[PDB]
Amino acid sequence: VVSHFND
Amino acid sequence: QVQLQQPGAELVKPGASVKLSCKASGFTFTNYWMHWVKQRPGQGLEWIGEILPSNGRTNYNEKFKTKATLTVDKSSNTAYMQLSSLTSEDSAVYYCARSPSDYWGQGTTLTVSSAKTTAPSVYPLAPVCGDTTGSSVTLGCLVKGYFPEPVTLTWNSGSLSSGVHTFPAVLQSDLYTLSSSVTVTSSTWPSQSITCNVAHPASSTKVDKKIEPRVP
Amino acid sequence: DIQMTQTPSSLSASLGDRVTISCRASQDISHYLNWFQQKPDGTVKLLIYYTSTLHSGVPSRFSGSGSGTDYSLTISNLEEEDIAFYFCQQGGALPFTFGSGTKLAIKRADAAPTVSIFPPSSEQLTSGGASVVCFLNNFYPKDINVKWKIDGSERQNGVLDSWTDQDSKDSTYSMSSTLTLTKDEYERHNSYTCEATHKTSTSPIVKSFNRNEC
Numbered sequence: 001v002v003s004h005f006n007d
Numbered sequence: 008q009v010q011l012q013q014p015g016a017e018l019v020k021p022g023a024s025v026k027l028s029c030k031a032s033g034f035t036f037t038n039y040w041m042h043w044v045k046q047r048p049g050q051g052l053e054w055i056g057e058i059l060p061s062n063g064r065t066n067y068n069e070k071f072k073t074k075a076t077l078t079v080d081k082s083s084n085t086a087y088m089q090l091s092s093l094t095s096e097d098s099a100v101y102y103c104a105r106s107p108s109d110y111w112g113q114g115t116t117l118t119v120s121s122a123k124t125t126a127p128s129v130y131p132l133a134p135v136c137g138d139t140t141g142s143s144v145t146l147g148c149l150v151k152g153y154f155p156e157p158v159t160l161t162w163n164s165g166s167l168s169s170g171v172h173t174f175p176a177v178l179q180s181d182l183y184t185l186s187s188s189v190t191v192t193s194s195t196w197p198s199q200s201i202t203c204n205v206a207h208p209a210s211s212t213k214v215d216k217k218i219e220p221r222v223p
Numbered sequence: 224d225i226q227m228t229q230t231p232s233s234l235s236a237s238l239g240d241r242v243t244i245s246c247r248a249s250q251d252i253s254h255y256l257n258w259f260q261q262k263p264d265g266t267v268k269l270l271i272y273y274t275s276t277l278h279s280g281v282p283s284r285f286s287g288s289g290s291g292t293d294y295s296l297t298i299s300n301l302e303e304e305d306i307a308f309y310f311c312q313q314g315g316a317l318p319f320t321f322g323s324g325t326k327l328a329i330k331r332a333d334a335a336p337t338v339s340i341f342p343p344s345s346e347q348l349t350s351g352g353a354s355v356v357c358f359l360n361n362f363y364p365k366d367i368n369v370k371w372k373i374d375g376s377e378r379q380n381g382v383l384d385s386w387t388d389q390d391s392k393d394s395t396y397s398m399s400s401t402l403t404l405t406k407d408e409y410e411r412h413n414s415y416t417c418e419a420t421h422k423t424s425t426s427p428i429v430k431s432f433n434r435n436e437c
Contacts, residue, residue, distance in 0.1 A: 001272070002106075002107035002272070003108075003255070003269065003272035004040070005316070006040070006317070051324065052312075052321040054321065106314075107272075108279070111267040113265060130343075131346070134339065135342050135432045149344075149347075151354065172358065175386070175387070176385075186356060186385065188399075190360070223435060223436075
């Protein structure tokens, strides 16, 4: 789970 | 623990450049995107761009492309953002952040002005002579035309602290102006003295304006 | 770029109330919707990411929901430390973008502004200017209007307003309005008035003075 698509 | 350390504020002149620092601690920033965001009171929040420390890859908001250049220093675990050709449009709070598991810095307030260190004029604020009637009375000090912020304003050397309203300074022209009100019981003033203490560090000025009744 | 529409821009609630803030994106953002909270000292924290994942240390009263284009942040039972400025950010596409923010404040009962008008000082008059100020103190709600009149005619140029943030003790708002004129302009007229227009009254609160009394 991340905050941005590219993280 | 995870922290991003940014300087509090800087004043720079139009046309100069500024290199804002963002020192990471509590983690190694190699594999985290380091983002930059601009916050100016009217306008919302604007994302400037991000850099990935490991390979220096960058993604910018097109709008900021030769305003903002992001770099990194791997040995100091520090992220930098240079702002060039500074204009009044660039005054704002600039934050740095990491992502994923995001943390933000405290933000650096950058002011771009060619204004010069000016001491404030401190005017007394008292009801027309007497006192527009009542059980309590409101006095005040008007601190006009200073630069740069801030101005420290107290009442009776900090002894008078409750019932006060000290408004945020506002920029009119290239100078700052602030006002402050104190409300006391009518019987207390005039009888007991009420002086506003103004200090303006930059111009190393300290002024005490006693508030008394007069006519116009 | 993807535009984020955040509503409401402002909201008042009482401690213990449920609060819901919403963000709508102009494109699908694939659940990458983040909620940030900002305090007056400028501190910013990420509360929730990927629509509904709480960040480290965030309290269980927070939660988020949504998908596609439509997202929401909810605080089941408001606490005082939640009074803050909230903003969403989509992370579904570059360049990343932000919503316009929601200023969450404390609800209290209406209170009329205590209005006080002050004449220019001789200190200021000696220097060539004349400032007339009016304090519109401890009122609620936050919307408030101040009207300046010189001789009964409306005056718009040369007014400088400043507003306090919500008071930590009585939850009221205050404002400073300053009308600045040159000394010779101030000497050309006689009556100076501020009119405070607020929802607590149908008629404005007017304070004035004449280059003259008492």
